[PDB]
Amino acid sequence: VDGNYSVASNVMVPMRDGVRLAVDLYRPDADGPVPVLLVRNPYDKFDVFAWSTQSTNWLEFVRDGYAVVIQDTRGLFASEGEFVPHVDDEADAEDTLSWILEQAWCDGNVGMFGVSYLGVTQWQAAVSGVGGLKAIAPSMASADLYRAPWYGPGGALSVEALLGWSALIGRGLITSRSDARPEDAADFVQLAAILNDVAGAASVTPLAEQPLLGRLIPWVIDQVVDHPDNDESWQSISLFERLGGLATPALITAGWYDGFVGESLRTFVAVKDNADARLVVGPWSHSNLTGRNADRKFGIAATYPIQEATTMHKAFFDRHLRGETDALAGVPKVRLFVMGIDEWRDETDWPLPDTAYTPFYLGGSGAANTSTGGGTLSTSISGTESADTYLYDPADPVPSLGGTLLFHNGDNGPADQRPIHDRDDVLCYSTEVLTDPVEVTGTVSARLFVSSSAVDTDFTAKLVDVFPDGRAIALCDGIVRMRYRETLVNPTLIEAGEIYEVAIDMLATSNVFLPGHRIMVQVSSSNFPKYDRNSNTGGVIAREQLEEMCTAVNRIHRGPEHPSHIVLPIIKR
Amino acid sequence: VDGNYSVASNVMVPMRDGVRLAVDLYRPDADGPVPVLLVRNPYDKFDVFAWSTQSTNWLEFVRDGYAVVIQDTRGLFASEGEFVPHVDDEADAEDTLSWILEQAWCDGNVGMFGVSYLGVTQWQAAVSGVGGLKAIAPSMASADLYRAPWYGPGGALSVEALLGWSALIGRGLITSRSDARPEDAADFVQLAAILNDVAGAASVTPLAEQPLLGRLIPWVIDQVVDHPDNDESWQSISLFERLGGLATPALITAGWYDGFVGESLRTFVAVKDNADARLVVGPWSHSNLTGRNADRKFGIAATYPIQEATTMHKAFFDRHLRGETDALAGVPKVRLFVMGIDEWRDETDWPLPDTAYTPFYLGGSGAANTSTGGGTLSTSISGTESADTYLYDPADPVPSLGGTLLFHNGDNGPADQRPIHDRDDVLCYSTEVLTDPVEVTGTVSARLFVSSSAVDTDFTAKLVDVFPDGRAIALCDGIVRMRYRETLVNPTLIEAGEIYEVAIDMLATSNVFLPGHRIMVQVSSSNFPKYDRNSNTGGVIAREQLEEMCTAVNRIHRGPEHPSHIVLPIIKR
């Protein structure tokens, strides 16, 4: 019977080493074999409601004749073995796909879908080159775990992401108990304590002393905290460089305020020439898909459109798993939620055709410190050689507000920046009030001429839409840790007082700055706990005591010989 | 096989009039018949992800040997017939339960669970007295539709709830299309426009002119707007008076900021003496179960505990549908999230034993207008005969901020009230800063001595926790429409200038006001769009043009002869 299905729980699938992973099978009532969709989940395959609302109404896939297989990753819940993030997922996916392909009910066509870790695991599956894998649909994911979510292109530790997620995994383990241990109850509450105060947990020095998290999940220190360089431990789990050689269609979803946005978008660029790649990007953060934020509402059209996503995924899989050549007729290649106008828009490519990568130069009379300073932005090179200076003190970092925060207040991406506007270490540069709309849609970066009293420090840049009613809404941001200014692999220190030209990768956005608004850029040297604080010493940051850290006198240089600027991807249509 | 199940879609169940409702059957792999759980859904039975995250991980019920039946209510999605809210649900549930009982796979024991309309439909099922119905679990629901969600105990129209929900239903209809109509696309966008600006749609006068909503769903005007009195049209769909005669166990869930809280709690009180009733109340609003709000965080323990709820429901159904007499061992009768201390607490009853219903009297030197006026609250009767006066103008009502809002900004219950503190029509009365904690847990009401220049007006009261850092956090509130001061059924007007003692039902809360905080009460004459605005005319409010409405000079009397006060349910433990 069309539309009917059955569910078999805890089918045990042997891996190459004989460890058995548990799966649930959702199989249509069908005469013969069917196309199959695989989901690889570290958050309990039984708990479908917790992730699916961020993905698709996938029971529709089953009612329409696909089988769906949901798997507990190694070492968690009903699965055997030992859990360590990322390291086993290439091999376990390969072995799982091989098993699926062998079954009576599989017709030789497999796809995958899912969000976050359920998205990352799809890139790890894709690189095995198993012929039966015909398509993936990674949502809010990354193919390079150093670049997202654990560090970033600027080489700073994403400390709130790490502690937040580790506490979540830890709480899952205390749930996914052999048998309840005496310490379980207390551990559970203490993990809650981290989740209730992520900046507080990230504030302890040395950062690398984690007696609760490092005990429950040694990987937190052993892999992440201990490897600040993008070294071979990172490069062993990175898929990115293998993506260029694949020919696997990918339906890629991202969010403008999602921790993974930079890396999600980069995977689209990496696969689009070799296979049918699709891109959808909404104004969401990782835990807030609603379109509603404390000080910014995008409208009900911005709410994660779960049914439309379901229809699109089905069209995508119908094309690639069922040979329906016309299934994606009229489906755009790229679909973006353009903020400001707050509308969904179809595009033919990402980056957009006719992107004008336009410098807006940092300028102004007198100090740019605070929102009431003299800092300006202009498409004209600044006429005189100035410099703005501030003191960056690790004991008082600029607090994170919105952006791509994951666990520490990660539900307010377009946050109003006014609470940090009166701070002396936040340099502000804004345009005149606009009389014509300016659409900025694309990747964003800054080039700054900088100097420090210290042998290492950070520089941050944050793009902001200043509204007429006073709201100063965060759009995108990034950081450069100075030791990593040229390379994330082979860092070197800087000379005090020497001027450097550095690049700041500020990820991507889509916003129309409307008449009446200003384009604003904040420059500082911290953004905590989104990123861990630079000690200003050149030492091993995570091993340092706060008391041992230094303040730094940091300087932004601007003028005709040091044309510091933000590069904005300008669209005129 | 234990843990395995099958799903049959669109099984068509004949009602007494021969109209067929569609159901999906989730049935365990079982030798013989099983206990059955029924869910009656107006939001598409296929779309399980949209409501279930507000309820239970109910697939666990199926893996553990219960069948689950999810039904499309009459006239929606796969069901035949014509949709009108509430009126068919008693009979359709009765007929559906009878059909379930007849099936090979039903062992004679039926229960129900679900949230909101999926909760209301359970009270409508319960009153049929079908013997096989052994238990219900209504979450965030009501047994009296006039009292929640459409009007309230104060006799004012809950206008944002009505327009918001009607627009949602309307959008569902445009989805649940015979075949797409030419006007569908535009209607859809215009319904979005209501949802994006609920106060704006509620602002149009006459309110009863609704060319889009009244066309899509005539009931909006025909039933709701047209019947402001709690008349026989309302009393035909009310279950409340029949609840006292039932002996059906009910697992009742509510939220402190949920539109249905007053009525959810009242159903517990109505059934607790005749059957095993259970109560769980968290700090949630109808669309925000996260425990996170713009200016108030309750901690991760406050996040709707979906797995714990699942375990409790299973224990409850194991007791009542499977005869497991010891299944609820160690399960509290009442479990409340106590705000302020922000902790879950077990109780033996609701109302709590040893509740001291304590008057806090309105007092102070000089005018109580604004937060910086002289208004005070005290357990001592005020010594001199004063009065506070303001002008209530319908064209400028006090905006709704937090509370039990449903669709207009209904995701911020504990809203900071500071944005309306400088208004002249908001009278404020606060205690001294507390040196000892004060726990207020129970139903809350006010008694005010009032007078008006008008022959009808409203009075509002709102309980507020003022934090040391300035936050003034809304807790509970209510309204009295003066014509309904004595009765919701037979209203009469008031004489201008004459003093009346009125009761304001402020629903319920659980909060510890901690040392350093103040207890604060706001008094006004509007709370829009939570409630529609009184025209101050004595006319038919929903039929009046704004231009035809009057301002009113309203007066709150306080002192030894007019001891206006709030009654707080004080707990000392």
Ligand SMILES: *C1(O)O[C@H](CS)[C@@H](CS)O1
């Ligand atoms: C997703 O499930 O949430 C996490 C945010 S850090 C991430 C881990 S790769 O995947």
Ligand SMILES: *C1(O)O[C@H](CS)[C@@H](CS)O1
């Ligand atoms: C629930 O499903 O949401 C509505 C809020 S007004 C309500 C209608 S009775 O049920």
Ligand SMILES: [Cl-]
């Ligand atoms: Cl089988």
Ligand SMILES: [Cl-]
């Ligand atoms: Cl293992």
Ligand SMILES: [Cl-]
């Ligand atoms: Cl262990």
Ligand SMILES: [Cl-]
């Ligand atoms: Cl907005």
Ligand SMILES: [Cl-]
């Ligand atoms: Cl749109």
Ligand SMILES: [Cl-]
């Ligand atoms: Cl100098």
Ligand SMILES: [Cl-]
């Ligand atoms: Cl130089």
Ligand SMILES: [Cl-]
């Ligand atoms: Cl059958």
Ligand SMILES: [Cl-]
């Ligand atoms: Cl009908």
Ligand SMILES: [Cl-]
């Ligand atoms: Cl019609």
Ligand SMILES: [Cl-]
């Ligand atoms: Cl708080």
Ligand SMILES: [Cl-]
């Ligand atoms: Cl608690």
Ligand SMILES: [Cl-]
């Ligand atoms: Cl007078």
Ligand SMILES: [Cl-]
């Ligand atoms: Cl009198």
